[PDB]
Ligand binder design. Structure first.
Ligand SMILES: NC(=O)c1ccc[n+]([C@@H]2O[C@H](COP(=O)([O-])OP(=O)(O)OC[C@H]3O[C@@H](n4cnc5c(N)ncnc54)[C@H](OP(=O)(O)O)[C@@H]3O)[C@@H](O)[C@H]2O)c1
Ligand SMILES: NC(=O)c1ccc[n+]([C@@H]2O[C@H](COP(=O)([O-])OP(=O)(O)OC[C@H]3O[C@@H](n4cnc5c(N)ncnc54)[C@H](OP(=O)(O)O)[C@@H]3O)[C@@H](O)[C@H]2O)c1
Lengths: 285, 281
């Protein structure tokens, strides 16, 4: 099959190389720290001695390092060896850095595809993998078959920063939800309730994750019907959360933050509308 | 069946009275603003004239208004009639306000039950109905059958404010999650991405065990990072820098950042994100 190069042998990089090898790709690997490829070489991987030698061994080069600052530090020595090849940046960073990488890649004659892995390494090489991809459509189709070895490719568009945008946007949701759960856990924990007793209920407050698409209809329509629950009614509930958190001894930074956003919308005349109307103030720094 | 009184005929109050009427309970209803009981009265409801007659008409009095100050203003005239009866307060408020109501009820000779409706009005009367209850166990056992008309009773304990604490905490999670989703929708929208195209992916990330898994790290006090708070914080930095460049407000993600920085300054950057609970506490 097509030869592929994985630059960076961390937890994810090692999984990526393994998935390429399992699909029959002659995989050339390289890492700054030696002693992490023993399992890959036993499966067929060729350990390269130089980044430039690794970049020159395959038509497709996948780089999976911590940030782009590292990606640019590793690949500058081989910046020209990227000649005529495609760089698949599966490093997670900002949309701006993905666009600067693309321009940097074009400067050195290389094609560029920006990717974002949305699963842990164990799920690479399996149908559970969700990898976003953005950049020139032709380049994706030309290498879609090779990238299938990693899992579920999902082309988003031509803008190199799209994949990163989806990435930071989905991590924005995940960590913000994370913080709310931990705050709720602490609040009930102030009265001795084990988190194991609150967790089955915290699963029910979300029931089917339908709200995602119900509110998306409002956002896309720009119409936030405040029928039933209004933003001002919801804001009253936040006040109860803040005063309960204060009374119970828990920090009230996060709930006050959500309260500030609600007030901003109410100050913009959305008091009557739904909570989804808070997006109107979220779009204004 | 047992007679029941419903004080407050807003969307929820009318749903509660209808659920009692369906279960065969003789239901007396009453509300400050007239003209909302026609459907209930056609199904058997008895519209009381005064709140003191309504309170006096039933052994079980269910009050469901906007807040605690409203219940205290609308029952203050009939505080004497409450003696010997049971006030089941389904009005959502703070745990402290729940403990105060129980005391006020006791001073007037009434048993008190604090409740928290976690479902919308349409779900009342249905198996999906989730209503938390707290207060003395005996009073709840005396009226479990009558309260079953409203749906899934979940008796939490004896503390009158316990049901309200579960209430605020689940709402803390719900609204915080809502805020994060809107911010993520705004972030993808800065590049024209329709919220309807993002919703399917937002679901895939949520794939529901993260609640129970962290509950054990929180119960054990052991936050093993392998993902560590230090790395997670660097991604939250990317969210802020990206949002600022994309023209999106950074207040909310920065609030999340301040929380991870607090736990890091406490010596948890090598623990899990779950360890944030320690600074929350
Ligand atoms: N759960 C996951 O693991 C997961 C899931 C989705 C996405 N990702 C993304 O995938 C990428 C890889 O993550 P990871 O799990 O492998 O851990 P990581 O610590 O983010 O990256 C480890 C890799 O980066 C290399 N590296 C970092 N800084 C370097 C530098 N200055 N010079 C040279 N190499 C450098 C490491 O080299 P050494 O090995 O020599 O130290 C190693 O190969 C990250 O961008 C991460 O956000 C990870
Ligand atoms: N319906 C829901 O979606 C839902 C779901 C779960 C929990 N809850 C909670 O359960 C309760 C039901 O709320 P709701 O949806 O019915 O609407 P609401 O606006 O929260 O409650 C309004 C009710 O309280 C009365 N009221 C409010 N302020 C009053 C005052 N100052 N003096 C006298 N009466 C006053 C209203 O009388 P008027 O009708 O005359 O204005 C009406 O009966 C609330 O505590 C809510 O937080 C509601």
């Amino acid at each position: 099959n097509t030869p592929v190069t994985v630059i960076g042998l961390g937890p994810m990089g090692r999984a990526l190389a393994g998935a390429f090898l399992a699909a029959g790709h002659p995989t050339t690997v390289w890492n700054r720290t030696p002693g992490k490829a023993d399992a890959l070489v036993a499966r067929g991987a060729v350990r390269a001695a130089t980044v430039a030698e690794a970049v020159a061994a395959s038509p497709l080069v996948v780089v999976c390092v911590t940030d782009y600052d590292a990606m640019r530090a590793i690949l500058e020595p081989a910046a020209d060896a990227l000649a005529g090849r495609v760089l698949v940046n599966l490093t997670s960073d900002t949309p701006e850095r993905a666009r600067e990488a693309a321009a940097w890649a074009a400067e050195h004659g290389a094609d560029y595809l920006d990717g974002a892995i949305m699963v842990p390494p164990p799920m690479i090489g399996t149908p559970e993998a969700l990898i976003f991809y953005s950049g020139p459509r032709e380049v994706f189709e030309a290498h879609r078959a090779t990238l299938a070895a990693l899992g579920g490719s999902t082309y988003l568009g031509e803008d190199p920063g799209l994949a990163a945008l989806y990435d930071v946007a989905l991590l924005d949701l995940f960590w913000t939800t994370m913080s709310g759960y931990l705050h709720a856990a602490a609040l009930v924990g102030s009265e001795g309730v084990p988190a194991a007793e609150f967790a089955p209920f915290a699963t029910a407050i979300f029931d089917s994750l339908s709200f995602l698409e119900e509110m998306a209809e409002q956002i896309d329509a720009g119409e936030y019907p405040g029928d039933e629950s209004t933003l001002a009614m919801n804001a009253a509930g936040i006040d109860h959360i803040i005063h309960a958190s204060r009374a119970q001894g828990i920090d009230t930074a996060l709930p006050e933050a959500v309260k500030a956003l609600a007030e901003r919308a109410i100050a913009a005349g959305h008091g009557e509308d739904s909570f989804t109307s808070v997006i109107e103030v979220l779009r204004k720094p």
